Amino acid sequence: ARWFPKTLPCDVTLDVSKNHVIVDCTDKHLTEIPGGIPTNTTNLTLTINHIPDISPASFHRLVHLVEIDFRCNCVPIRLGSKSNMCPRRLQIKPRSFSGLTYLKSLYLDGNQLLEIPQGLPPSLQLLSLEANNIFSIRKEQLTELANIEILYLGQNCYYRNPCYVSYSIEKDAFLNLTKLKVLSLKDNNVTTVPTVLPSTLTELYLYNNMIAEIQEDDFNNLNQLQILDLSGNCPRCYNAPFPCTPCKNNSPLQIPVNAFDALTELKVLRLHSNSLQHVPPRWFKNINNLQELDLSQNFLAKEIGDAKFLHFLPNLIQLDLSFNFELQVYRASMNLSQAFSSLKSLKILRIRGYVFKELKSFQLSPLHNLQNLEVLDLGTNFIKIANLSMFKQFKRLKVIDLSVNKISPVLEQLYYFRYDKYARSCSCYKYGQTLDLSKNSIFFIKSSDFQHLSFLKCLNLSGNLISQTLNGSEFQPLAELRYLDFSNNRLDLLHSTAFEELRKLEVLDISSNSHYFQSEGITHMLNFTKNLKVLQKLMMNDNDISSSTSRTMESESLRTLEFRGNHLDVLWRDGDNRYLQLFKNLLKLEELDISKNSLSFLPSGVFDGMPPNLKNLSLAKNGLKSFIWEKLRYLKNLETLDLSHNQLTTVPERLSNCSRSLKNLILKNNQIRSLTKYFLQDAFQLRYLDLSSNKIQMIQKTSFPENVLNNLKMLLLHHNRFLCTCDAVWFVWWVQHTEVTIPYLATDVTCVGPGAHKGQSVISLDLYTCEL
């Protein structure tokens, strides 16, 4: 169907609309730029290869290049692979870029460049050189960047990439860059705010450096600036998960009361981890459009009880005061000043790590009339006592986050403590008001705990110590709850009435409640689903279920059931019939996940026991060694069948005879060593076939008739054991000229033999000697 196979080990994409021809050679194990990149090419990406040099030959004919992404061909030793270290830094010849008169972006991050490449074209707007070894910026070396708008110079001198000296910036070095809009000098061992900066700046990033003092003429001319980040200068180093040296005498970063007076257009000010003990109100008189303020990881515990500066922040949308506890203090309560009530625009308020024992309703009084307050995040505070009913006054909020506390009767997992949360590399909220009580110490629950909280749409009890026999009496106020996360508890299904009070329950997660399922003789009423008339999705993963008092689960509403990580192999012990219909009366079940169930075989009758409308069935990761494909005829609405990561050695003789409906067949990571002679014959609804990571040596046209292959949206065959003899002539030819999508022709569709062709990719194979 193609006259000319593409040998090029890169994805080539066309945007005729944006007149962009995108060549992506990310991570293709290249040691030189490939030959034959399309002449018209605009976007060329070579990230994560081992190309040792750039020279005028490199970009060649590619005079239409508007972006070169040549990152991480020589990553700093502590940041890159230690099994494939880069031996000598990237070498950039003179004259390598001067010819590309249209070049608008040059990414050279992570190549151990010692100096800024020069001879760059006047079209250049973005220059990225993060994670190199450039720690002296001289103004003459920036002449070439007259038109530059975004300059990334960070991470050239920090603990993961040390330069052992201070960062040096010549006076006024960036001033004649009259179009510079974003300047990043983060993670650089900078000692002073470089002056004078061009007034064009909208974004200035100076965080995680060694700046101890702000002079007040540092930001005199930054009247266009919108983002200022001074975080991590004089860091608060307690439990730092990276090497951290605070400023001497525990000094804060010193910012004169008026250093921000020119920042008329400042929208976000990040002063995270500056060891601040006060926030002088005078900082903020001339910014009255500030919307985002980060004051986390300082020493502002008492300042939180005062905070006169809040009165000057009426347009503030986000305010972060997390981790300001003073070391070794366990406050009894939270003293929030009334000044918080003047934060009329406030949508996001986060105060993690204040560390106090009791939260009572009055201490949140300053927030009672913040009419757009959407998120109150009080996590990681070791609160032991809280009347949950106090949150009736916050029916308005979208998320009340008490995660990680000690109560008893989405941000990254390393977020507040990560060194550079913005470092570049080479959930039930949608249902409505959410109260997150996850990772707490609630050992018992009763309906009263939730009085005056009827409005809740999603409730998170994940990771508590709830080990009680739910009989439908524990959650009665929560008449609108649609989502209950009950995972990582010890649910005791003694009563088939568990959870039935939640009459609008749509999603129930009782995954990882294996405690009681792991001990013999305990009763488990699995048919409790009969009572949740609205339930749509039930997750009971990793429960170790191997016995059930009830022989059938019943639901008229349930569409998806996650039953992964249990012991259906024991429930379906060969000879025991009693549970072969456990799922039959889930009448609108469309998706069943029973991967990870040790099902080395499926008893006869499992398929007949499946509910009538099943579309998507996962039997992955079961150690399946045999499979009676013919019993798929019982699965009359089956469209996706996932047999990945098993021990299957054969495919059916006639897939067409096993199902008239199957669309997506996933057979990756099995032991298949060859296909049956007429495998796919007349399988006209087959659309997706993953056979990757098997042991296939040959594929003849008998098994892959082209009138079924050619309607495949995708066809995965990488990581097999292909034998590229003259007997393979049709498969090699078909792989070379098909329009069907086959991922990884470059890196993993390969001959294992014979000898001559070993490790050679099938797409590059010349089999002319088979035709003499």
Ligand X SMILES: *[C@@H]1O[C@H](CO)[C@@H](O[C@@H]2O[C@H](CO)[C@@H](O)[C@H](O)[C@H]2NC(C)=O)[C@H](O)[C@H]1NC(C)=O
- CB 255, CB 231: distance < 8 Å: no
**SS3 letters for 435-501?**
EECCCCCCCCCCHHHHCCCCCCCEEECCCCCCCCCCCCCCCCCCCCCCEEECCCCCCCCCCCCCCCC
Taking CB under 8 A as the rule, which mask of x and - marks residues 308-347 in contact with a copy of itself? ---------------x------------------------
Residues 345-384 that bind a copy of itself (CB under 8 A): 352-353, 380
CA distance 412 to 46: 29
Residue 399, binding choice from ligand EX0, ligand NAG, a copy of itself, none, Cβ under 5 to 8 Å by partner class: none
- Interface pick for ligand X out of 73, 184, 189, 208 (rule CB under 6 A): 189
The answer to the question of residue 79 lying near a copy of itself (CB under 8 A) is yes
Closest CA to 699 of 663, 751, 741: 751
The answer to the question of residue 382 lying near ligand EX0 (CB under 6 A) is yes
Taking CB under 8 A as the rule, which mask of x and - marks residues 49-78 in contact with a copy of itself? ----------------------------xx
Place of tokens 């990680």: 404
CA distance 736 to 623: 34
- Interface pick for ligand X out of 157, 204, 301, 680 (rule CB under 6 A): 157
Considering the complex, state which of residue 156 and residue 693 has its C-beta at the smaller distance from ligand X. 156
Residues 573-592 that bind a copy of itself (CB under 8 A): 573-578
The answer to the question of residue 158 lying near ligand X (CB under 6 A) is yes
b/e per residue, 481-491, with b = 16+ CB within 10 A?
A: bbbbbbbbbbb
> At a CB cut-off of 8 Å and minimum separation 6, what does 172 contact?
139, 195, 196
Taking CB under 6 A as the rule, which mask of x and - marks residues 456-485 in contact with ligand EX0? ------------xx----------------
Place of tokens 């054969």: 650
Residue 330, binding choice from a copy of itself, ligand NAG, ligand EX0, none, Cβ under 5 to 8 Å by partner class: ligand EX0
Residue 238, binding choice from ligand NAG, ligand X, ligand EX0, none, Cβ under 5 to 8 Å by partner class: none
Residue 271, binding choice from a copy of itself, ligand EX0, ligand NAG, none, Cβ under 5 to 8 Å by partner class: none
Q: Is 1 helix (H, G, I), strand (E, B) or coil?
A: coil
- Phi/psi of residue 275, each to 5°? 55, 35
Closest CA to 693 of 651, 735, 721: 721
DSSP code at position 331: B
The answer to the question of residue 406 lying near ligand EX0 (CB under 6 A) is yes
Considering the complex, state which of residue 455 and residue 516 has its C-beta at the smaller distance from ligand EX0. 516
* Binding footprint of ligand NAG on the chain (CB under 6 A): 20, 22, 43, 66-67, 104-105, 387, 389, 392, 403, 427-428, 438-439, 451-452, 460, 462-463, 468, 471, 473, 483, 485, 496, 525, 527-528, 530-531, 549-550, 554, 591, 593, 616, 618, 633, 640, 657, 664
Place of tokens 């305990």: 522
Closest CA to 45 of 15, 66, 74: 66
Helices (H), 229-316: 301-304
DSSP characters for 67-88?
EEE---SS--TTTS-STT---S
CB of 2 to ligand NAG, least distance (A): 23
Taking CB under 6 A as the rule, which mask of x and - marks residues 100-139 in contact with ligand X? ----------------------------------------
CB of 706 to a copy of itself, least distance (A): 31
- Say if residue 702 carries a ligand binding annotation: no
- Interface pick for ligand EX0 out of 14, 101, 330, 726 (rule CB under 6 A): 330
CB of 271 to a copy of itself, least distance (A): 19
Token pair listed for 661: 């409906």
Q: With CB under 8 A as the contact rule, which of the stretches 149-157, 174-182, 569-577, 609-617 interacts with a copy of itself?
A: 569-577
Place of tokens 């708008």: 149
Token pair listed for 632: 């798929």
Closest CA to 383 of 400, 365, 366: 400
- CB 43, CB 70: distance < 8 Å: no
Would you tell me how many other CB atoms lie within 10 Å of the CB of residue 193? 21
Residue 619 Cα distances to 297, 592, 607, 631, angstroms: 47, 9, 12, 14
The answer to the question of residue 725 lying near ligand X (CB under 6 A) is no
- Say if residue 523 carries a ligand binding annotation: yes
Considering the complex, state which of residue 578 and residue 737 has its C-beta at the smaller distance from a copy of itself. 578
- Interface pick for a copy of itself out of 35, 241, 329, 769 (rule CB under 8 A): 241
Residue 34 Cα distances to 7, 57, 85, 569, 604, angstroms: 10, 12, 22, 51, 54
The answer to the question of residue 407 lying near ligand EX0 (CB under 6 A) is no
CB of 353 to ligand EX0, least distance (A): 6
Closest CA to 305 of 346, 356, 260, 345: 356
Q: Work out whether the CA dihedral 486, 488, 490, 496 comes out positive or negative.
A: positive
Measure CA 622 to chain center.
27
Considering the complex, state which of residue 195 and residue 468 has its C-beta at the smaller distance from a copy of itself. 468
CA distance 543 to 564: 8
- CB 365, CB 390: distance < 8 Å: no
CB of 404 to a copy of itself, least distance (A): 5
The answer to the question of residue 164 lying near ligand X (CB under 6 A) is yes
Considering the complex, state which of residue 193 and residue 526 has its C-beta at the smaller distance from ligand NAG. 526
Q: With CB under 6 A as the contact rule, which of the stretches 151-159, 201-209, 539-547, 697-705 interacts with ligand X?
A: 151-159
- Interface pick for ligand EX0 out of 175, 494, 742, 752 (rule CB under 6 A): 494
Q: With CB under 6 A as the contact rule, which of the stretches 98-106, 323-331, 339-347, 580-588 interacts with ligand EX0?
A: 323-331
Q: Is 572 helix (H, G, I), strand (E, B) or coil?
A: coil
- Say if residue 766 carries a ligand binding annotation: yes
- Interface pick for ligand EX0 out of 79, 126, 522, 767 (rule CB under 6 A): 522
CA distance 749 to 754: 15
Token pair listed for 306: 């005062």
The answer to the question of residue 552 lying near a copy of itself (CB under 8 A) is no
* Residues that constitute the known binding site for Ca(2+): 766
Q: Give me the residues that bind ligand X (CB under 6 A), please.
A: 157-159, 162-166, 189
Q: Give me the residues that bind a copy of itself (CB under 8 A), please.
A: 77-79, 81-83, 159-162, 239, 241-243, 323, 352-353, 380, 404, 406, 408, 413-417, 439, 441, 443, 463, 465, 467, 515, 518-523, 546-547, 549, 570, 573-578, 600-601, 625-626, 647
Q: Give me the residues that bind ligand EX0 (CB under 6 A), please.
A: 325, 328, 330, 353, 355, 382, 384, 406, 468-469, 492, 494, 516, 521-523
* Residues that constitute the known binding site: 382, 406, 492, 523, 766
* Residues that constitute the known binding site for guanosine: 382, 406, 492, 523
